Design a protein around this ligand. Structure first.
Ligand SMILES: COc1cc(C(=O)N[C@H](CO)c2ccccc2)ccc1-c1cn[nH]c1
Ligand SMILES: COc1cc(C(=O)N[C@H](CO)c2ccccc2)ccc1-c1cn[nH]c1
Lengths: 388, 388
């Protein structure tokens, strides 16, 4: 019967109307209706009276910020911050990304986090940072992810004189990790060393997918907006980013070329937002460099106009490049080899590979008590995810 | 863990936050927010866009009025009406009680149907009419119950010269059926021949429980209001029905005394709303009657002041009365004996034992399109029940 069908929708962790998402919808109404000015409506107060006891019982069973003890703030900026936390119950230590609902609403747009949530939750790849539980209170969205103790690629590049042997590895892992996102039907529209994190064994995993989009059946993310950093931007998604356009998988691979270039040159290839259009002309290596001919070959293969750019005819095109030819590892067993930098850590709460951002110390800014129905928690309905 | 606990709440058909009730909450928001005047809110439109496709897919899987083909209107009045219907799919024929959400809201109070729903759904008794599915659209509450082809006790009394043998049986079944409701922690506050329906074999079952309440741990339904018919009202819940009072189980048994009296006398015992206070003085039988001394004995046993009234010291007190002593049946096997009037029916859609109330033929009055948030479907959140 139809009850067999409607039962998949209730179970399916991917479904926006699964029991946890459904619960969010009800929890939203209590948050958005329990105001003196609004309670004057008969319908509003009858419902609030009927349900307030129940939702508050639920709120104490369901995952809440109080279940974790905040250790340090390992990251910050762009609406929220990331904290190294520990589960009070299981004693397991994770990285949790708090995201301000007030700022997210005030500064408009409250729909970027959807792909960040779906990718980390349903990637099922050793190349993507795993989201265990997504939950929320009246002030924040919460994302509990596996802690990447190794830190990010920005500080690795800044603390070492990165040899070619290392760039060969890190680029390879970025290629595999980036391919996993492509398989999932997503296009990053912004790949950076900031999003490249290292696990306990020194291996790469991608994180922070706020800049993503699901590609149409044609194989393109048809957009007429300039979303991304001004150095990792492709000439494809720059010339038609406000005058009829539809970006693709190609533009993502351009960023890998910028990454490998930065790793070996110690600066960005193009540097008040052009030279990327003239990409042929302006691309130069510091003469004379120790950079191998194959490192330069692959860099140009990526930093070229869309139509001929490497990665248009699949992933294997890249995997086959001579730059990756090495005696130490193979694509199939890459994640099983010893990484160039394996973090020598002390405790399960060691943040040495992370910049010291002080433990918050501020005033939690909040939304105001309304007179009319607002629905401020409305957009965050369906954000809760539990990996059961 | 706490997820084991919160999982019972999601399954439990009695729970107001079970998946079907949860779904209602979301379905309510779409009904109550999809208005041009309201859509102007950003939060409202983002949510409506995100969910409108899904809820409409759900609305076509979930039980809806269109799943049944209306045959006849077997009953009516007091906000709704009852129709003999057939399941288009299973071809099973039921009685469905449509209840106007507009009138229920307009004339205030939209919380009487809760006990009517819980009693019929969770009675699990051959003495109570079974509710299979409770569902709802934007205009009505729906109650699908097993059809009682035998009709009600009002027309039985009016079509026959009811002998003592019959009153012995009908009163016995009313006593058992009424005890089932008492076990469930409810007090009818209005028992009538209108609520007494007969199954296909001519046996009694109680229906229409709008006038109910759940009794406190003391064993009383502490009320200071006069809810009930002016002839079946007890002196206990009349003298203290607007001047400090707390009614009980006793007042329900008074109505059984009125019923047995009506069955044998052909009129009501008290008949511009007194004589019930003077219950001793005014109680008289039409001299001289053919009514047996035991029939009169039991009638007085019920129609007396609370403090001494039969039924105060349990059900067995009543079951033990000599009026019930008979050679034909016993309390334990009463429902297994041949009933006084077994309906000789033609088809599975025969309504001969029901008054002919024309097939509606009118204008469906509706709520108005609002400018501000109303929440008209708010009270009906949690009404949906499926006996899976
Ligand atoms: C610092 O660690 C992280 C940071 C991020 C991340 O997305 N950070 C950026 C800023 O860099 C951000 C954006 C928006 C709001 C807040 C923060 C994602 C995962 C981790 C992490 C570390 N271990 N496991 C997971
Ligand atoms: C006529 O049949 C019924 C009537 C009722 C019932 O409650 N009727 C009253 C009016 O009499 C009413 C009150 C409020 C709104 C509408 C109707 C309840 C069950 C049946 C029935 C018949 N077979 N199975 C179930």
């Amino acid at each position: 019967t139809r009850f067999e069908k409607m039962d998949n929708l209730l179970r399916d962790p991917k479904s926006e109307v699964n029991s946890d998402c459904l619960l969010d919808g009800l929890d939203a109404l209590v948050y958005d209706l329990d105001f003196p000015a609004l309670r004057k409506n008969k319908n509003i107060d009858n419902f609030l009276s009927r349900y307030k006891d129940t939702i508050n019982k639920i709120r104490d069973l369901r995952m809440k910020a109080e279940d974790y003890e905040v250790v340090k703030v390992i990251g910050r900026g762009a609406f929220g911050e990331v904290q190294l936390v520990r589960h009070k119950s299981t004693r397991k230590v994770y990285a949790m990304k708090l995201l301000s609902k007030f700022e997210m609403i005030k500064r408009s747009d409250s729909a970027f986090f959807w792909e960040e949530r779906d990718i980390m939750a349903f990637a099922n790849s050793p190349w993507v940072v795993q989201l265990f539980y997504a939950f929320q209170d009246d002030r924040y969205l919460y994302m509990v992810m596996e802690y990447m103790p190794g830190g990010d690629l920005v500080n690795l590049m800044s603390n070492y004189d990165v040899p070619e042997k290392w760039a060969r590895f890190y680029t390879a892992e970025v290629v595999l990790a980036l391919d996993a996102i492509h398989s999932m039907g997503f296009i990053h529209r912004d790949v950076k060393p900031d999003n490249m994190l290292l696990d306990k064994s020194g291996h790469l995993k991608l994180a922070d997918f706020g800049t993503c989009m699901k590609m149409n059946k044609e194989g393109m993310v048809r957009c007429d907006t300039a979303v991304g950093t001004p150095d990792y931007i492709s000439p494809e998604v720059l010339k038609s980013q406000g005058g009829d356009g539809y970006y693709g998988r190609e533009c993502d691979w351009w960023s890998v070329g910028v990454f490998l270039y930065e790793m070996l040159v110690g600066d960005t290839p193009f540097y008040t937002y052009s030279k990327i259009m003239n990409h042929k002309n302006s691309l130069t290596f510091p003469d004379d460099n120790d950079i191998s001919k194959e490192a330069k070959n692959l860099i140009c293969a990526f930093l070229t106009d869309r139509e001929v750019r490497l990665g248009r005819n699949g992933v294997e095109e890249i995997k086959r490049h001579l730059f990756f030819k090495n005696d130490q590892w193979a694509w199939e067993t890459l994640r099983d080899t010893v990484a160039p930098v394996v973090p020598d850590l002390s405790s399960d709460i060691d943040t040495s590979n992370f910049d010291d951002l002080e433990e918050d110390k501020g005033e939690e800014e909040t939304f105001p008590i309304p007179k009319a129905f607002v629905g401020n928690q409305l957009p965050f309905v369906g954000f809760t995810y539990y990996s059961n």
